[PDB]
mmCIF file of C-alpha atoms in Angstrom:
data_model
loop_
_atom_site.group_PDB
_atom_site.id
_atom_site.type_symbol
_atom_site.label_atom_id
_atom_site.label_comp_id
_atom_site.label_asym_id
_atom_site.label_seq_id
_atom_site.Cartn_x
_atom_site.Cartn_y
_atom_site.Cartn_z
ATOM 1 C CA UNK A 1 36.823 32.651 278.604
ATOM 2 C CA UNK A 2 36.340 28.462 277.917
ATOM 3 C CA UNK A 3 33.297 28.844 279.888
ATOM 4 C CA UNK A 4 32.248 31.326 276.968
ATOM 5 C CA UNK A 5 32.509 29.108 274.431
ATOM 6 C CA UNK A 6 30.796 26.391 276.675
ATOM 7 C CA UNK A 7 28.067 28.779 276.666
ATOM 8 C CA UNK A 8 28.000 29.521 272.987
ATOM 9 C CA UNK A 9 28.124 25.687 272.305
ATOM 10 C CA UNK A 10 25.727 24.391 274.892
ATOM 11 C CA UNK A 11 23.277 27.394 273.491
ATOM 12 C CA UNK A 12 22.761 25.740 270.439
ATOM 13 C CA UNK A 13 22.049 22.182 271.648
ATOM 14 C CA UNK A 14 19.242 23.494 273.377
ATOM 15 C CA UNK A 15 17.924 24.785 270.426
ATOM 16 C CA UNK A 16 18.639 21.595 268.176
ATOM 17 C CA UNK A 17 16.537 19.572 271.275
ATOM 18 C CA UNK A 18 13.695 21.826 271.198
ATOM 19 C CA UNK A 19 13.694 21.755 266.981
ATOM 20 C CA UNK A 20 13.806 17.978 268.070
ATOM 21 C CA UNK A 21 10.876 17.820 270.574
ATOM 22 C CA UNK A 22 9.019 20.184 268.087
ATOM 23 C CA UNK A 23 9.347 18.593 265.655
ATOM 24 C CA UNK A 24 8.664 14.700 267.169
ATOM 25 C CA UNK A 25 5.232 16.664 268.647
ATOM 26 C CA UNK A 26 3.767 17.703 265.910
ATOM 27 C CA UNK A 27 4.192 14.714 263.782
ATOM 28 C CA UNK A 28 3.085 12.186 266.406
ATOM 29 C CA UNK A 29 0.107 14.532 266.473
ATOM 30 C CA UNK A 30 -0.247 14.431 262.528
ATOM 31 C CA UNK A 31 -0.413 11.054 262.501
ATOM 32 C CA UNK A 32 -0.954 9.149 265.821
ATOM 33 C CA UNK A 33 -1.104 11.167 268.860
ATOM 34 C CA UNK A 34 1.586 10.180 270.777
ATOM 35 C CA UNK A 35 3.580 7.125 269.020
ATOM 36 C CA UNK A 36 6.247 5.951 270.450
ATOM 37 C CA UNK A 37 8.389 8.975 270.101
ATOM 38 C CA UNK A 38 11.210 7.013 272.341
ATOM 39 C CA UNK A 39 12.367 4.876 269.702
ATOM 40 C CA UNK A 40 10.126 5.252 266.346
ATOM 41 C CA UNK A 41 12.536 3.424 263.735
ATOM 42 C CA UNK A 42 10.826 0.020 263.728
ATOM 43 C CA UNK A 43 7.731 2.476 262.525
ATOM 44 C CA UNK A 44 9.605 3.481 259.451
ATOM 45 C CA UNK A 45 10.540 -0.393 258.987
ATOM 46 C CA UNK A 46 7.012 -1.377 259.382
ATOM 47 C CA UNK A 47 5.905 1.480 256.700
ATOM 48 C CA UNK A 48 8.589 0.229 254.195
ATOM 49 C CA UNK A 49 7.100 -2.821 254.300
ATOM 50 C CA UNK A 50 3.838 -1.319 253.616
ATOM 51 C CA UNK A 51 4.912 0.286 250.757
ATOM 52 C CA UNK A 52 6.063 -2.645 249.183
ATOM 53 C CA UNK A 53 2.570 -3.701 250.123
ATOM 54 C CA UNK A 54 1.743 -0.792 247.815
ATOM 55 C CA UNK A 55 3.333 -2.412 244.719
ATOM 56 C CA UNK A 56 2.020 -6.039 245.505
ATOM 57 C CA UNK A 57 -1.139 -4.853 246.051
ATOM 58 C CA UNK A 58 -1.829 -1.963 243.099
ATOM 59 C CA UNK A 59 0.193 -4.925 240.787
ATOM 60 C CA UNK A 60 -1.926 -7.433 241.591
ATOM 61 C CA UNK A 61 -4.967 -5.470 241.577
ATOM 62 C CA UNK A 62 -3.984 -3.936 237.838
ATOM 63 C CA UNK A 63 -3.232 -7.230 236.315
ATOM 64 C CA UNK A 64 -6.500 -9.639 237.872
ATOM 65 C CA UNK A 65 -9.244 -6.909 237.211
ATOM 66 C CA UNK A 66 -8.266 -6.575 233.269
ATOM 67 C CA UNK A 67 -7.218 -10.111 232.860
ATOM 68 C CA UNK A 68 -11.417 -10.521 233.810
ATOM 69 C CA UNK A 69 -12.086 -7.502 231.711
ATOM 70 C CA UNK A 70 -10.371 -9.300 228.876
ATOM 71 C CA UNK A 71 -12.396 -12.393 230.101
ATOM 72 C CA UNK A 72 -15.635 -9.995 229.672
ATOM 73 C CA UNK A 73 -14.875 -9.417 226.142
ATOM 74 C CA UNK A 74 -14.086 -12.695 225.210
ATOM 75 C CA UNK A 75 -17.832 -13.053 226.511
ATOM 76 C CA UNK A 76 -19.144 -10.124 224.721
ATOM 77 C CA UNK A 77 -17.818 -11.749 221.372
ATOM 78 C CA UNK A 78 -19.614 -14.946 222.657
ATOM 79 C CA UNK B 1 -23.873 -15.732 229.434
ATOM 80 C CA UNK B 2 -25.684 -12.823 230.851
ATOM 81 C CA UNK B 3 -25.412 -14.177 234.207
ATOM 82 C CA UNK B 4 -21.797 -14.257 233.698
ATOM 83 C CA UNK B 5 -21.699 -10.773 232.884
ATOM 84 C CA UNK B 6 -23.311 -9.348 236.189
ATOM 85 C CA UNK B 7 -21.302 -11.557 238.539
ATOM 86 C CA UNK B 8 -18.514 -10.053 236.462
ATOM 87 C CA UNK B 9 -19.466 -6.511 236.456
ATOM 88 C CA UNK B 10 -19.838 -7.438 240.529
ATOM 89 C CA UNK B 11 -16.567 -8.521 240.783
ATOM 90 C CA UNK B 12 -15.275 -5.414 238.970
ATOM 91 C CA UNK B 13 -16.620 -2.957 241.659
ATOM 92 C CA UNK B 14 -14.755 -5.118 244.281
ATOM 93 C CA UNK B 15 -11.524 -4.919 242.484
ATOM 94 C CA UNK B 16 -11.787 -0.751 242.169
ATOM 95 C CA UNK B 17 -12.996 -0.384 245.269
ATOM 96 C CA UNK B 18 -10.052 -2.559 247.097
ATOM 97 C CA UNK B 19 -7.307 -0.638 244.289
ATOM 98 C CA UNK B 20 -8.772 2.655 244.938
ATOM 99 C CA UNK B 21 -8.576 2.188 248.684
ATOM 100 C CA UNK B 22 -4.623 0.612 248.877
ATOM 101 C CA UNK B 23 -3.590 2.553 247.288
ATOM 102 C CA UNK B 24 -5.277 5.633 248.753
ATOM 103 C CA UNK B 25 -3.601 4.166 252.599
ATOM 104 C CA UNK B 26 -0.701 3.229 251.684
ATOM 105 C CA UNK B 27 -0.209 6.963 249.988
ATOM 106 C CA UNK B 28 -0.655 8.816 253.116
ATOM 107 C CA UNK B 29 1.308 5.997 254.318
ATOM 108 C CA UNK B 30 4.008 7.163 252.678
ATOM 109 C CA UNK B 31 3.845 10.775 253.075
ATOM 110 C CA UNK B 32 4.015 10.506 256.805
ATOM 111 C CA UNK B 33 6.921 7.886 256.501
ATOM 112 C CA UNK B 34 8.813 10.822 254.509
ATOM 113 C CA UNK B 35 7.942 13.018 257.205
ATOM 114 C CA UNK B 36 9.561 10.988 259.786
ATOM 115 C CA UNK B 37 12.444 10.375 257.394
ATOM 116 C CA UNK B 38 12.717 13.590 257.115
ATOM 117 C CA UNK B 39 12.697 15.934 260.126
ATOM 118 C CA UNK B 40 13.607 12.884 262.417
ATOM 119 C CA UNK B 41 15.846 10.358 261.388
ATOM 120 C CA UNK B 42 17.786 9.516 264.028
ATOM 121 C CA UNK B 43 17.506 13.402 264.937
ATOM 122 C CA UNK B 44 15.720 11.558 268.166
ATOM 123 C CA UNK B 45 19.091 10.026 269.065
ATOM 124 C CA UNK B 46 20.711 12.838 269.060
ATOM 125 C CA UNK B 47 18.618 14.894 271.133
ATOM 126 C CA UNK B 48 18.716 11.154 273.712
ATOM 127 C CA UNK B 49 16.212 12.813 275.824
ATOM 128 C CA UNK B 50 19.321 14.214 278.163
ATOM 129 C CA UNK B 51 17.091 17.453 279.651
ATOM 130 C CA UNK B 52 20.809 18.875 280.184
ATOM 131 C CA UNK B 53 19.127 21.939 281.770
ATOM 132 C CA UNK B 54 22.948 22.934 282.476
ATOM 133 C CA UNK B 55 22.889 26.560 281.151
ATOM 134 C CA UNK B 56 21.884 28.100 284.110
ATOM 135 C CA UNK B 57 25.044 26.819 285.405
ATOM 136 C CA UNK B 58 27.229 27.799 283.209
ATOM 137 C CA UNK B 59 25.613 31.136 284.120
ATOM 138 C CA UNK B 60 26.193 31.242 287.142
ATOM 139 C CA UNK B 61 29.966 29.917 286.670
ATOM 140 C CA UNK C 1 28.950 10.302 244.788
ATOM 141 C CA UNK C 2 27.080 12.780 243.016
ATOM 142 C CA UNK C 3 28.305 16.203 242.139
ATOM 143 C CA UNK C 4 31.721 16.972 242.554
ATOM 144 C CA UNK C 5 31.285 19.755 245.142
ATOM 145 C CA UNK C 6 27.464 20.535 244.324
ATOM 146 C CA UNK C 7 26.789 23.355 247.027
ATOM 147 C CA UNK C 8 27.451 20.606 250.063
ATOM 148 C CA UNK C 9 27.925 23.512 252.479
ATOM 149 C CA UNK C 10 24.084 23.301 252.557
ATOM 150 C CA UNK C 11 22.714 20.841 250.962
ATOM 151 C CA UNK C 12 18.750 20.895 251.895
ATOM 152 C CA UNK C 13 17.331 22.112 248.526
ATOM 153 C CA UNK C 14 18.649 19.269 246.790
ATOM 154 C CA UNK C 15 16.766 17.236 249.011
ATOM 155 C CA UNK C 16 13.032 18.412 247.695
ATOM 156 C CA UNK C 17 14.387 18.044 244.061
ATOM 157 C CA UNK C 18 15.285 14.294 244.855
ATOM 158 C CA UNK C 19 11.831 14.518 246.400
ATOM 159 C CA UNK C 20 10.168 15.502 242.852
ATOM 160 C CA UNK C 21 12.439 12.491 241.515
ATOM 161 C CA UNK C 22 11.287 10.208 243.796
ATOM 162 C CA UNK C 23 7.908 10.469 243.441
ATOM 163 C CA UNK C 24 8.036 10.522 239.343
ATOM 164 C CA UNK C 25 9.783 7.756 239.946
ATOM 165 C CA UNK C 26 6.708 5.897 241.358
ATOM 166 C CA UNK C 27 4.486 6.894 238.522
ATOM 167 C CA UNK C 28 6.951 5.870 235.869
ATOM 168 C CA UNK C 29 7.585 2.818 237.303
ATOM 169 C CA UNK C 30 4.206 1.773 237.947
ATOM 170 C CA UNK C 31 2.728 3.010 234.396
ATOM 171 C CA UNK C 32 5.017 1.297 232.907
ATOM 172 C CA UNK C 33 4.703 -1.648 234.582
ATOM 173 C CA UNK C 34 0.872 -1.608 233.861
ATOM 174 C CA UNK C 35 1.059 -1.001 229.849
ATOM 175 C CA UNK C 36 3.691 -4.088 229.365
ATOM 176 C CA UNK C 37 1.659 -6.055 231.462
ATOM 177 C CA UNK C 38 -1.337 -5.179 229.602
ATOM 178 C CA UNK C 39 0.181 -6.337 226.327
ATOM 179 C CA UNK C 40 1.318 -9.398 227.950
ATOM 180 C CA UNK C 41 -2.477 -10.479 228.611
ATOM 181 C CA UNK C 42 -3.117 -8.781 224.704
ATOM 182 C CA UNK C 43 -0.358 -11.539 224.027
ATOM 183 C CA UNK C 44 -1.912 -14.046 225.469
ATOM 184 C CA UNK C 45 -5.318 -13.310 224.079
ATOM 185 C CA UNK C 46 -3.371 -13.237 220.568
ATOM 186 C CA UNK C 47 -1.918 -16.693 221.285
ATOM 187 C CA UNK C 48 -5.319 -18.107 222.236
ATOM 188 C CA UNK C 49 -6.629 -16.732 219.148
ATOM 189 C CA UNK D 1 -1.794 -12.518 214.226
ATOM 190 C CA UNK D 2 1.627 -13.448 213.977
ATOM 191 C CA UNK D 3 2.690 -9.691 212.414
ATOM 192 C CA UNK D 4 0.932 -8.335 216.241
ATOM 193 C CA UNK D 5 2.799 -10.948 218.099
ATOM 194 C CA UNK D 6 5.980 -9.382 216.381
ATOM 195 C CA UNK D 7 4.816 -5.516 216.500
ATOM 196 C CA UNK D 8 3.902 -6.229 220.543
ATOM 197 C CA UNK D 9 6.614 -7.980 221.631
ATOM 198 C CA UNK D 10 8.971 -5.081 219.885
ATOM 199 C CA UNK D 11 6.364 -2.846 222.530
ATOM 200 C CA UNK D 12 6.849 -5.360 225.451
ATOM 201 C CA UNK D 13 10.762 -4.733 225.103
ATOM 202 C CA UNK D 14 10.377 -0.688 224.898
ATOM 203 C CA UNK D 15 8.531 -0.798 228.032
ATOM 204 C CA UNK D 16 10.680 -2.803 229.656
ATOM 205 C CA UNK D 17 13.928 -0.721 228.573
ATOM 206 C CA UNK D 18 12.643 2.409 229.292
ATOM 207 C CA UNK D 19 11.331 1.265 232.801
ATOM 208 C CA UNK D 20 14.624 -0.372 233.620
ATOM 209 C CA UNK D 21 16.917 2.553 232.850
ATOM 210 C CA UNK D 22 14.021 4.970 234.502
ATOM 211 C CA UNK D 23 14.279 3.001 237.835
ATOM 212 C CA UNK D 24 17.865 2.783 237.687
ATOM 213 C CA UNK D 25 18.708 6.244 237.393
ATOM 214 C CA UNK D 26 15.564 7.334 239.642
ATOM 215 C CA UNK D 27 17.006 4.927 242.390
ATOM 216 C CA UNK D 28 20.289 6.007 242.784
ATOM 217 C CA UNK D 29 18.609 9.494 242.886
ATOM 218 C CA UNK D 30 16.793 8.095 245.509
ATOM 219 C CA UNK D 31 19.395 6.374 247.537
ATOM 220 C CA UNK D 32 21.345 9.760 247.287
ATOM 221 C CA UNK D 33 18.798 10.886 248.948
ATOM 222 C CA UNK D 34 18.461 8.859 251.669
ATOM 223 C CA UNK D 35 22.242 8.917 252.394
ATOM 224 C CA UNK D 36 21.828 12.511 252.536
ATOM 225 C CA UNK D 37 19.301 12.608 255.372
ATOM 226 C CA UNK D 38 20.618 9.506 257.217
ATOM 227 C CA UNK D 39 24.026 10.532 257.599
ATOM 228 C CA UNK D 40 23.678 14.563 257.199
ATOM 229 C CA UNK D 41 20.277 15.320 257.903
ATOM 230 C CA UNK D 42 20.985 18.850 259.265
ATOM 231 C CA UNK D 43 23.505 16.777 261.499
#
Protein backbone atom coordinates (compact mmCIF):
# COMPACT_ATOMS: atom_id res chain seq x y z
CA UNK A 1 0.00 0.00 0.00
CA UNK A 2 3.04 2.95 0.54
CA UNK A 3 4.27 1.77 -2.68
CA UNK A 4 0.73 3.00 -3.98
CA UNK A 5 1.01 6.21 -2.99
CA UNK A 6 4.73 6.23 -4.25
CA UNK A 7 3.16 5.50 -7.43
CA UNK A 8 0.44 8.09 -7.32
CA UNK A 9 3.12 10.72 -6.27
CA UNK A 10 5.98 9.82 -8.54
CA UNK A 11 3.07 9.82 -11.46
CA UNK A 12 2.71 13.31 -11.30
CA UNK A 13 6.37 14.42 -11.30
CA UNK A 14 6.68 12.88 -14.48
CA UNK A 15 4.11 14.84 -15.78
CA UNK A 16 5.29 18.26 -14.15
CA UNK A 17 8.98 17.29 -16.02
CA UNK A 18 7.50 16.70 -19.28
CA UNK A 19 5.12 20.16 -18.87
CA UNK A 20 8.78 21.32 -18.01
CA UNK A 21 10.74 19.98 -21.05
CA UNK A 22 7.64 21.09 -23.15
CA UNK A 23 7.48 23.87 -22.24
CA UNK A 24 11.58 24.91 -22.17
CA UNK A 25 11.30 23.34 -26.08
CA UNK A 26 9.08 25.30 -27.48
CA UNK A 27 10.20 28.57 -26.19
CA UNK A 28 13.90 28.06 -26.94
CA UNK A 29 12.44 27.33 -30.36
CA UNK A 30 10.29 30.66 -30.31
CA UNK A 31 13.02 32.56 -29.71
CA UNK A 32 16.54 31.03 -30.11
CA UNK A 33 16.69 27.49 -31.00
CA UNK A 34 18.24 25.92 -28.35
CA UNK A 35 19.42 28.60 -25.56
CA UNK A 36 20.84 27.54 -22.84
CA UNK A 37 17.92 25.72 -21.42
CA UNK A 38 20.42 24.40 -18.45
CA UNK A 39 20.47 27.47 -16.60
CA UNK A 40 18.52 30.45 -18.54
CA UNK A 41 18.17 33.07 -15.54
CA UNK A 42 21.14 35.29 -16.43
CA UNK A 43 18.87 35.56 -19.87
CA UNK A 44 16.04 37.12 -17.99
CA UNK A 45 18.77 39.42 -16.17
CA UNK A 46 20.26 40.37 -19.40
CA UNK A 47 16.55 41.21 -20.87
CA UNK A 48 15.76 43.37 -17.75
CA UNK A 49 18.47 45.26 -18.51
CA UNK A 50 17.30 45.67 -21.95
CA UNK A 51 14.21 46.88 -21.00
CA UNK A 52 15.51 49.53 -19.08
CA UNK A 53 17.37 50.06 -22.31
CA UNK A 54 13.80 50.51 -23.56
CA UNK A 55 13.11 53.58 -21.36
CA UNK A 56 16.66 55.20 -21.88
CA UNK A 57 16.44 54.76 -25.27
CA UNK A 58 12.49 55.72 -26.31
CA UNK A 59 13.28 58.80 -23.46
CA UNK A 60 16.04 59.95 -25.03
CA UNK A 61 14.86 59.52 -28.42
CA UNK A 62 11.33 61.51 -27.46
CA UNK A 63 13.01 64.39 -25.84
CA UNK A 64 16.28 65.12 -28.61
CA UNK A 65 14.06 64.73 -31.83
CA UNK A 66 11.38 67.54 -30.58
CA UNK A 67 13.86 69.59 -28.73
CA UNK A 68 15.29 69.91 -32.80
CA UNK A 69 11.74 70.10 -33.93
CA UNK A 70 11.32 73.03 -31.60
CA UNK A 71 14.79 74.15 -32.97
CA UNK A 72 13.04 73.85 -36.62
CA UNK A 73 10.43 76.24 -35.68
CA UNK A 74 12.43 78.63 -34.08
CA UNK A 75 13.96 78.54 -37.76
CA UNK A 76 10.74 78.66 -39.52
CA UNK A 77 9.95 82.00 -37.56
CA UNK A 78 13.50 83.07 -38.70
CA UNK B 1 18.61 78.89 -43.29
CA UNK B 2 17.32 76.52 -45.83
CA UNK B 3 20.31 74.48 -45.58
CA UNK B 4 19.61 74.19 -42.01
CA UNK B 5 16.32 72.92 -42.62
CA UNK B 6 17.29 69.80 -44.82
CA UNK B 7 20.16 68.68 -42.59
CA UNK B 8 17.38 68.97 -40.03
CA UNK B 9 14.65 67.23 -41.76
CA UNK B 10 17.80 64.51 -42.29
CA UNK B 11 18.38 64.23 -38.90
CA UNK B 12 14.66 63.73 -38.18
CA UNK B 13 14.41 60.48 -40.29
CA UNK B 14 17.42 59.15 -38.24
CA UNK B 15 15.80 59.83 -34.98
CA UNK B 16 12.29 57.86 -36.15
CA UNK B 17 13.95 55.40 -37.70
CA UNK B 18 16.37 54.50 -34.52
CA UNK B 19 12.84 55.16 -32.03
CA UNK B 20 10.75 53.13 -34.26
CA UNK B 21 13.26 50.31 -34.32
CA UNK B 22 14.12 50.20 -30.14
CA UNK B 23 11.50 50.21 -29.43
CA UNK B 24 10.09 47.69 -31.90
CA UNK B 25 13.27 45.02 -30.31
CA UNK B 26 13.12 45.68 -27.20
CA UNK B 27 9.06 44.91 -27.41
CA UNK B 28 9.43 41.45 -28.55
CA UNK B 29 12.14 41.61 -26.12
CA UNK B 30 9.90 41.75 -23.62
CA UNK B 31 7.24 39.48 -24.63
CA UNK B 32 9.59 36.57 -24.75
CA UNK B 33 11.14 37.65 -21.31
CA UNK B 34 7.37 37.27 -19.96
CA UNK B 35 7.28 34.06 -21.55
CA UNK B 36 10.19 32.74 -19.76
CA UNK B 37 8.92 34.43 -16.61
CA UNK B 38 6.13 32.84 -17.04
CA UNK B 39 5.99 29.12 -17.87
CA UNK B 40 9.65 28.74 -16.52
CA UNK B 41 10.79 30.49 -13.68
CA UNK B 42 12.74 28.41 -11.86
CA UNK B 43 10.17 25.61 -13.09
CA UNK B 44 13.75 24.36 -14.71
CA UNK B 45 15.06 23.78 -11.18
CA UNK B 46 12.58 21.91 -10.25
CA UNK B 47 12.40 19.53 -12.93
CA UNK B 48 16.89 19.47 -12.24
CA UNK B 49 17.10 17.36 -15.24
CA UNK B 50 16.91 14.06 -12.76
CA UNK B 51 15.45 11.54 -15.79
CA UNK B 52 14.12 9.56 -12.56
CA UNK B 53 12.79 6.95 -15.03
CA UNK B 54 11.90 5.04 -11.62
CA UNK B 55 8.22 4.14 -12.37
CA UNK B 56 8.82 1.11 -13.97
CA UNK B 57 10.18 0.11 -10.74
CA UNK B 58 7.83 0.90 -8.64
CA UNK B 59 5.88 -1.33 -11.05
CA UNK B 60 7.47 -3.96 -10.79
CA UNK B 61 7.76 -3.63 -6.79
CA UNK C 1 -0.47 41.29 0.60
CA UNK C 2 -3.25 41.75 -1.61
CA UNK C 3 -6.67 40.34 -1.11
CA UNK C 4 -7.50 38.87 1.99
CA UNK C 5 -8.19 35.34 0.69
CA UNK C 6 -8.79 36.37 -3.11
CA UNK C 7 -9.41 32.77 -4.66
CA UNK C 8 -5.53 31.68 -3.68
CA UNK C 9 -6.54 28.03 -4.10
CA UNK C 10 -5.82 28.87 -7.79
CA UNK C 11 -4.58 31.80 -8.41
CA UNK C 12 -3.56 31.83 -12.35
CA UNK C 13 -6.30 34.19 -13.69
CA UNK C 14 -5.19 36.88 -11.60
CA UNK C 15 -2.02 36.58 -13.18
CA UNK C 16 -3.23 37.77 -16.94
CA UNK C 17 -5.21 40.64 -15.20
CA UNK C 18 -1.85 41.86 -13.56
CA UNK C 19 -0.68 41.20 -17.10
CA UNK C 20 -3.31 43.88 -18.60
CA UNK C 21 -1.95 46.15 -15.60
CA UNK C 22 1.36 45.78 -16.41
CA UNK C 23 1.39 46.63 -19.71
CA UNK C 24 -1.04 49.90 -19.21
CA UNK C 25 1.31 50.56 -16.95
CA UNK C 26 4.03 51.07 -19.65
CA UNK C 27 1.88 53.28 -21.76
CA UNK C 28 0.85 55.48 -18.89
CA UNK C 29 4.05 55.86 -17.72
CA UNK C 30 5.71 56.61 -20.82
CA UNK C 31 2.86 59.11 -22.20
CA UNK C 32 3.08 60.79 -19.45
CA UNK C 33 6.46 61.11 -19.25
CA UNK C 34 6.52 62.46 -22.90
CA UNK C 35 3.69 65.34 -22.48
CA UNK C 36 5.55 66.88 -19.19
CA UNK C 37 8.61 66.68 -20.91
CA UNK C 38 7.23 68.32 -23.84
CA UNK C 39 6.07 71.30 -21.79
CA UNK C 40 9.32 71.43 -20.15
CA UNK C 41 11.08 72.26 -23.65
CA UNK C 42 7.54 74.64 -24.29
CA UNK C 43 9.01 76.12 -20.92
CA UNK C 44 12.06 76.65 -22.00
CA UNK C 45 11.12 78.08 -25.34
CA UNK C 46 8.78 80.48 -23.14
CA UNK C 47 11.78 81.49 -21.01
CA UNK C 48 13.92 82.20 -24.08
CA UNK C 49 11.20 84.22 -25.37
CA UNK D 1 4.33 84.91 -21.17
CA UNK D 2 4.48 84.91 -17.62
CA UNK D 3 0.41 83.90 -17.29
CA UNK D 4 1.76 80.42 -19.67
CA UNK D 5 4.69 79.96 -17.44
CA UNK D 6 2.02 79.84 -14.55
CA UNK D 7 -0.87 77.87 -16.56
CA UNK D 8 2.15 75.17 -17.67
CA UNK D 9 3.84 74.68 -14.74
CA UNK D 10 0.18 74.03 -12.95
CA UNK D 11 0.25 71.19 -16.23
CA UNK D 12 3.90 70.10 -15.47
CA UNK D 13 2.68 69.23 -11.78
CA UNK D 14 -0.65 67.26 -13.05
CA UNK D 15 1.49 65.16 -15.11
CA UNK D 16 3.76 64.50 -12.73
CA UNK D 17 1.03 63.57 -9.95
CA UNK D 18 -0.91 61.54 -11.97
CA UNK D 19 2.21 59.59 -13.31
CA UNK D 20 3.57 59.14 -9.83
CA UNK D 21 0.47 57.69 -8.19
CA UNK D 22 -0.15 55.63 -11.70
CA UNK D 23 3.33 53.95 -11.32
CA UNK D 24 2.95 53.45 -7.78
CA UNK D 25 -0.12 51.62 -7.72
CA UNK D 26 0.71 49.85 -11.22
CA UNK D 27 4.05 48.64 -9.54
CA UNK D 28 2.97 47.05 -6.64
CA UNK D 29 0.44 45.40 -9.06
CA UNK D 30 3.32 44.42 -10.76
CA UNK D 31 5.54 43.18 -8.03
CA UNK D 32 2.41 41.12 -6.89
CA UNK D 33 2.80 39.69 -9.77
CA UNK D 34 6.04 38.66 -9.89
CA UNK D 35 5.92 37.26 -6.31
CA UNK D 36 3.16 35.26 -7.53
CA UNK D 37 5.05 33.43 -10.27
CA UNK D 38 8.44 33.36 -8.47
CA UNK D 39 7.39 31.78 -5.43
CA UNK D 40 3.95 29.97 -6.64
CA UNK D 41 4.20 29.69 -10.18
CA UNK D 42 2.05 26.51 -10.42
CA UNK D 43 4.67 25.31 -7.71
Amino acid sequence: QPLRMRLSELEQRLNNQQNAERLLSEFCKRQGRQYQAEDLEALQNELEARQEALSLSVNEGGERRMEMRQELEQLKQK
Amino acid sequence: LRQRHTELEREVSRFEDQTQQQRQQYAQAKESLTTLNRLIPQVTLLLDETLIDRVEEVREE
